[model samples]
Target: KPFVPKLVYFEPEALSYPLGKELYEKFTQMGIKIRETTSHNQVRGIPGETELARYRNAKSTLVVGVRRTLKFDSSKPSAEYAIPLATGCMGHCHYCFLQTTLGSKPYIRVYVNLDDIFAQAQKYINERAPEITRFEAACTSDIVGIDHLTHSLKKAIEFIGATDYGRLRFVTKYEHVDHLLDARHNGKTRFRFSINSRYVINHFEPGTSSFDGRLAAARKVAGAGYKLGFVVAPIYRHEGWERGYFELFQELARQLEGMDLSDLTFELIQHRFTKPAKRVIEQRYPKTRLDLDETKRKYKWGRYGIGKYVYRDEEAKELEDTMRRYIEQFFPGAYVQYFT
Candidate 1:
């Protein structure tokens, strides 16, 4: 099972809606246990639940609720704002940054009131008339993984596709693209897959799609005429790191040889993390081998003035330069969206 919710909880108000009713009935037929709740916050505290145990349980639980709060978050490089479609993910990637923010309640939350959310998105686009409003959908969760249950990604894709000004952007490590193949995206949604070196995938990323699976799914999306992008993130440095990343690019080029490279873009991010993230990851996975040693890295203050341990200037520069060189060599026409 891609995702089998141990306990499926729904808000009382959500069942009154159409999407909510459909999901409730569907899951019911699948033999999954469904429970009604006043609010998701109520399930946060369970009797005799330890912090680590609660975190473990939350990953398997699913919450179907209404997104009463319809405020869009300010986005960075990709889009103008974040449109919250869901929260949390099913993948157990050890270096996940969400560990710090999501804490104990790591369960997946799917918002049922998408029509209202899209309406609000339309309003944001209308306010900025001549300019197009872009929305980042995967800020808090991987929409693609849980999309099979909710069909929200397909809905969002079609909804934004028909719009005059708004476009949707999301990134995922999971390879659940079959359901979305028939979506009327109209080339408006920028579909990005988060891929990394084989070493990183084998060690840091677990319980997610394999590197080959991701590339195959990328080919499928590209063939379907979607604007395809790749995010080679948390680019770690180790012995033979260059060779690994180069091979990855080579494989991408070989696989994507016949596909149109006009809309292909890449975002490269080096591995960096804060002290708090290290602590949370250590607690979540006590046996994790993630290299969070601050003493080895240079301390740099982010825009929020919070310091994070990153690679030394010369080392980071070398990594970026090598990646750029590979991009130019292997994928000639592919665009480098950003490197950080």
Candidate 2:
């Protein structure tokens, strides 16, 4: 798939509207202050200054958004909160739903409301007590890389650790994690690196870290006494499936040589994309190698369905078997959290 530039990149004041609008409302209501804005990307590059300017003009560059109170009990295993701290991402993965769903982005838009988010989260906790057990950092952005800039993930660790939020599940594919390491965090948050085989990393996850690099990061995090996990799905069924995964696992085994595997978790899924998202994706990157079969993608998250787009039962079982065997052989006692 080819990377498509967003209209927002071309539109004047595209950064200000919607994003700034939402931030303004939330910051005022929450009474939070935005201190400074930071970034690792060079500000002189294309879209750099414009992106920085968008973040700077905001009051504190920090804001908050709280979901309406719900009847769902957070204490239950099924309950989860998907907060959107940021809108678009910089990493241009071919299969990314953001391309179509977010509508723009050769550039990434950041959300700067860590303080307010934590404050509101605290209030929710006091009100709900132990009923809320887990909080998934909203589905919108990569917590690690952005956290380096806004320090949002650090704030999350500090806040969730103080309270009893159970487990903070953070999923990311970024390479910038210095903030995470320097934060002096314990096992307050469970970090999962979204990893695919080398083939997928080389072909799809452009501008993102390499598979082995991510696995190395996971091992380092685990070595520092943090819970580590991985998700490998939305994976394509191309040729040399076994070899690709074997190479991935080989690197992991080397990385995990002495690290405790008990805190590790693994999840797998087959490829899936919505029709609308697919249309946008296909339009943007017409050369996408995604397998479009109705039997694989039967479920929909918005306009995309997971009927033929997802893995069939036989293939799913095969994936599960391979992963289970790998886990048993190398990292005994590790949690194979989910098969599907």
Candidate 3:
């Protein structure tokens, strides 16, 4: 189901942009509650009593504004830069780092000034004349989930498709790609699905598509002539962990049987969480079964000297080996991008 916001807040200046203007009229026709925001950066008066209530309210709220900052952040192995097409997400995943990264401003914000953002992207693409400059569109937000509202992902995909030295990639946990099928992607966009075990999906990821729904969309995406990828993230090691993941890979194998699998890839990341994130996630999802027990994890210092709890070396290695084996067994032609 597409996300329909209960309330929408828009920056007055955003109406200057064509997309922004269309959105204002679109919501007006729907008779949804609309308010004007002073600035997209700080929004006030989101109605809720408790923290969880406020968070839930914010999730259903939509913020439309222009992206004032166009400079992208480095995404390293995933892509060259994390493009700033949008911020915040509607899906409520218990372990999402955005719980802290997005902080109190959890409303989905779509940048209407696409021309300026793409112009800035073109500058970066031209600067790296020889090297292919790749952009991660969903680094901070699930652009595909918000695509139904903005059609921005299709626009960004076509933008990169036109460039000779650029590629666009983004991961989505939602199954909303019917509109994106006819985009002139030209195989320049790697559309990735974020899949997890059924246990994790049911217990952790709320307001997202099921594994069945996601893979079903994956089959359609492959038929659409776009490169495919899967991010089997937060690989939890619970009871019957092997069986759970094996079933997941088996289902994927059954879905994409005969498509060209040359550009297929898999990214594995074991579950890890920071202290601040754990506090926020627990507060947001009190009944979560996220397994953030520090005793079962080892402290690892991440970038900026912040610490995160990851599985110990022995368990990490075993999980990595098994996941690699599953990828090799199911799709030998696929590439294992990285085991984080």
Candidate 4:
């Protein structure tokens, strides 16, 4: 489907790594190749030329290899590219996309040339379109939790702030709001919080900040004048969903005390994945409480249900009606972007 899978391991210096050999195979079925790379120069082929150059010059002791193209995939129009700076994360959310794939234990394999990532990102965007560009951050790790400590994001921000490639957006669930407030930069760095109802968050993403806490942080950042976005993602189908989501949105509006909503953007996606990705995810997380299978259905992207993922014509209309009505009421005139 994407790349081929291979097996390899790192020395004791590595604090985290991938698990379940079978899982690697699952990725390979799609055409992706998983390998090991101690240096950034190890990357080559496809859009890797620039990445390889960046990797060779880094000084980090721990490193790993995940060979996938860095181009925009036509399949997932919502994302420009999936860039991984680290293999694992400090948070332990069970529904985390990384849990079934990247191991649960926090791994500290920082890419030696994070500067290169920024450099490449800048080049990639400028060459394609100098007008506006967007990329997702820490699809694997918490961009804020470790960024302050390592100061990587600070540098990245400075670079982004200094340049005009476009906009930089990241998703976070951490409580460390103060970190970004102190950072200095003019980049249109947008910080979006992955939000759910307080109950859903407390029940699913344990160890992350409470829903209220996260909203407070978002409010702080938004007030600071940095752009803000909201991801009401992985929309769950459960009892009282409408009420639950409405309350969540209301609380969000309430907590955003000082921030303006004119520049704010809202994104939400119904859960969907390749059947194989689901199979691998379920196998590794046997105890997972996610009821994905309950509404499971196949779509071009894979198996997913919930209007955004797959919908019969009638279901699609109903889904749109439901989402639009509430959105119009709460987020009136705001940008509402959805993912499939």
lDDT of each: 0.85, 0.57, 0.89, 0.56
lDDT of 4 by residue, 117-185 (tens): 666777767876866666666666676655543455666666767776655667788767676786665
Alpha-carbon shift of residue 76 in model 4 (angstroms) = 5.2
Give the 10-residue window scoring lowest on summed lDDT in candidate 1.
Answer: 40-49
Tens-place lDDT per residue, model 3, 219-312, is: 8898999899999988999788899999889888898888888889999989988878768888998898877788888999767557788899
Give the number of the best model, judged by TM-score: 3
Specify the poorest-scoring 10-residue window by lDDT in model 3.
Answer: 96-105
TM-score of each: 0.94, 0.71, 0.97, 0.69
* TM-score ranking of the models: 3, 1, 2, 4
lDDT of 1 by residue, 1-340 (tens): 4676777889989988888999899989989877877886566543236778877777888888888877797877878998978988888898887776533358888889888998898889999977998999998898888898888989999999998888999998888789898899998999999988888889888878888888888988888878999998988996689899999899888977877787689998898887788778888888877888888899887675466778999989999999999999988888998887
Weakest lDDT window of 10 consecutive positions for candidate 2: 1-10
Q: In candidate 2, what are the lDDT values of residues 161-251, reduced to their tens digit?
A: 7776444777778756655775545466778889778778877787677776677778666766677888775556668877777667667
Q: Which stretches of candidate 3 lie over 4 Å from their true place?
A: 102-104
- TM-score for candidate 4, please give it: 0.69
Residue 265's lDDT within candidate 3 is 90
**How would the candidate models be sorted by lDDT, starting from the highest?**
3, 1, 2, 4
In order of listing, the candidates' clash counts read 0, 23, 0, 14
Residue 270 of model 2, lDDT score: 62
